[PDB]
C-alpha cells in the first residue's frame, strides 16, 4: 500500500521490458536463445523557436523536414555508428576479420551506371541485380590530395568449392587520393555471379588507408583472369600481410539474387556449366516402424514405404 500504483498499462509495460534485459539469478529466455558546439546548437534552437512561421506550421500540422539535408548531416555526424551496426548485423566483421571490429569513417559512395544519368546508389544492405552491375561502378569518397588509399570488392559468400572463402571481384591498389583511375588494377572487374537458388549473396566494398606505397606483387592477378579458381581469396591473410600499412576506413555492401546475366557470366567468360542449387529440407521424423501398429490408422503403412508403385516379386 505504501508504494503507488502504475495506473497505466504503458508504465507497467516499459518497466517490464527493462527488467527482462537485466541479468537475473533464475534462468530466463535470453540465456537460452565540444562545449562550444553545444552552445552553437542551443543558439540555433532558439532561432528556430523564435520563428513564428515555424510555430504556425507546426500548430497547423503542415510542416515537413528535408530528408536530403538530414541524410548528409547524419552521415557526417553520427552515421558511422549506425553503419557499424549494419556491418555487425550482417556479420561483416565476424567474417572478414574473424570478429575484429573497425568503425567506418569515410562516407564512401558507390553507384552503378545504367545507360544514362540513372545511378543506382549502393548503400548498406541494398538490393542490386547482377544485370545492373555488369560494369564497374563509380566510387567517390573525397580522399583529398596527398591521401594514398586502396579499394577492394568482395563477395564474402561464394567459392562454390570452398566454404570459408571469398572471391575478389576487383582490387585497385596504390590509389592516390580521391581519383581512382590512377589505381593499379591488380584484378579486373568481374560481373556478379550468384548461382541460381543459392539465396542472397552479400557483396561488400571496403577501403583501406594506404600509408606508404607497397607493391602487392603477390596479390597481382593476370589480367584478364577468367580462371575463377584463382579468384580464391581471404581478407584476413591479405590484411595481416599489409596490416602495418593498411587500415580500413570505408564500407559499402549490397546483396543480389540470381539473374539472367549470371547465366551469361558462367558461360561466356567463366566458360563452364552454371551450377543450380535448391533448398532441401531434412526428411520428416517417423518413430521406428512396428510389426503391429496398434490403434494406428491405415495411413501408417504409407509413411514407411519408398516406392509409390506396386511390386509383384516372384509373380
Amino acid at each position: 500500500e505504501r508504494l503507488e500504483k502504475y495506473r497505466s498499462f504503458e508504465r507497467y509495460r516499459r518497466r517490464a521490458e527493462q527488467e527482462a534485459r537485466a541479468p537475473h539469478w533464475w534462468r530466463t529466455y535470453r540465456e537460452h536463445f565540444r562545449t562550444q558546439k553545444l552552445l552553437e546548437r542551443k543558439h540555433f534552437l532558439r532561432e528556430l523557436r523564435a520563428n513564428v512561421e515555424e510555430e504556425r506550421a507546426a500548430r497547423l500540422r503542415t510542416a515537413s523536414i528535408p530528408l536530403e539535408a538530414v541524410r548528409a548531416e547524419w552521415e557526417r555526424t553520427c552515421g558511422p555508428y549506425h553503419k557499424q551496426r549494419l556491418a555487425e548485423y550482417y556479420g561483416l566483421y565476424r567474417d572478414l576479420f574473424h570478429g575484429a571490429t573497425f568503425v567506418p569513417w569515410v562516407p564512401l559512395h558507390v553507384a552503378y551506371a545504367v545507360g544514362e544519368e540513372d545511378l543506382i546508389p549502393v548503400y548498406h544492405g541494398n538490393e542490386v541485380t547482377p544485370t545492373e552491375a555488369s560494369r564497374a561502378p563509380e566510387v567517390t569518397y573525397e580522399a583529398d590530395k596527398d591521401s594514398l588509399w586502396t579499394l577492394l570488392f568482395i563477395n564474402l559468400d561464394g567459392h562454390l568449392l570452398e566454404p570459408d572463402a571469398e572471391y575478389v571481384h576487383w582490387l585497385l591498389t596504390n590509389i592516390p587520393s580521391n581519383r581512382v583511375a590512377e589505381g593499379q588494377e591488380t584484378c579486373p572487374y568481374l560481373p556478379p555471379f550468384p548461382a541460381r537458388g543459392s539465396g542472397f549473396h552479400r557483396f561488400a566494398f571496403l577501403l583501406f588507408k594506404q600509408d606508404k606505397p607497397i607493391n602487392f606483387s603477390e596479390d597481382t592477378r593476370p589480367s584478364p583472369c577468367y580462371q575463377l579458381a584463382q579468384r580464391t581469396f581471404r581478407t584476413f591473410d591479405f590484411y595481416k600481410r599489409h596490416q602495418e600499412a593498411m587500415t580500413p576506413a570505408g564500407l559499402a555492401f549490397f546483396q543480389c539474387r540470381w539473374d539472367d546475366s549470371v547465366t551469361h557470366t558462367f558461360h561466356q567468360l567463366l566458360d563452364m556449366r552454371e551450377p543450380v542449387f535448391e533448398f532441401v529440407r531434412p526428411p520428416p521424423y517417423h518413430p521406428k516402424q512396428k510389426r503391429f501398429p496398434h490403434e494406428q490408422p491405415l495411413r501408417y503403412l504409407d509413411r514407411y514405404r519408398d516406392s509409390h508403385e506396386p511390386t509383384y516379386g516372384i509373380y
Binding site: 508504494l3 503507488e4 500504483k5 502504475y6 495506473r7 497505466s8 498499462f9 508504465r11 507497467y12 509495460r13 518497466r15 517490464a16 527488467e19 527482462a20 537475473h24 533464475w26 534462468r27 530466463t28 529466455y29 540465456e31 537460452h32 536463445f33 537458388g197 543459392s198 539465396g199 556449366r273 552454371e274 551450377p275 543450380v276 542449387f277 535448391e278 533448398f279 532441401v280 529440407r281 531434412p282 521424423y285
Partner: protein, 100 residues
C-alpha cells in the same frame, strides 16, 4: 486426469509432442510452444525443453488482466513460468541439383 509434466527439462523433443497437461495455468506457453484447447502444451519445433521464469504482460483488451496488472506496486512486476523448446536443427540446406 494424470495431469503433469510429460517431458522434463533437457529432453530431446520432436514436433507435435506434448510437454505438460494442466487443469489451470501452472505453466504458460513460451517460445516455439503451442497451446491446446484443453490448455495442454506441445512442441511446435523439434528441440530441447527449457523452463524459465519471465515477466507476464497480458493483452490490452482483456479487462481483468489489465486492471490487475495496472494495480501493482510501482517497484516490481509479477512473473510466471514459461516452457520453451530450443530448435536443434537448421530449417534446410542448399544442395547441388544439376550442372547445366
Amino acid at each position: 486426469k494424470h495431469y503433469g509434466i510429460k517431458k522434463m527439462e533437457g529432453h530431446y523433443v520432436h514436433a507435435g509432442n506434448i510437454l505438460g497437461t494442466q487443469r489451470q495455468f501452472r505453466w504458460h506457453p513460451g517460445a516455439h510452444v503451442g497451446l491446446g484447447r484443453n490448455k495442454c502444451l506441445y512442441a511446435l519445433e523439434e528441440g530441447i525443453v527449457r523452463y524459465t521464469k519471465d515477466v507476464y504482460v497480458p493483452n490490452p483488451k482483456n479487462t481483468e488482466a489489465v486492471d490487475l496488472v495496472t494495480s501493482l506496486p510501482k517497484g516490481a512486476v509479477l512473473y510466471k513460468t514459461f516452457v520453451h523448446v530450443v530448435p536443434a536443427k537448421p530449417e534446410g540446406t542448399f544442395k547441388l541439383v544439376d550442372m547445366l
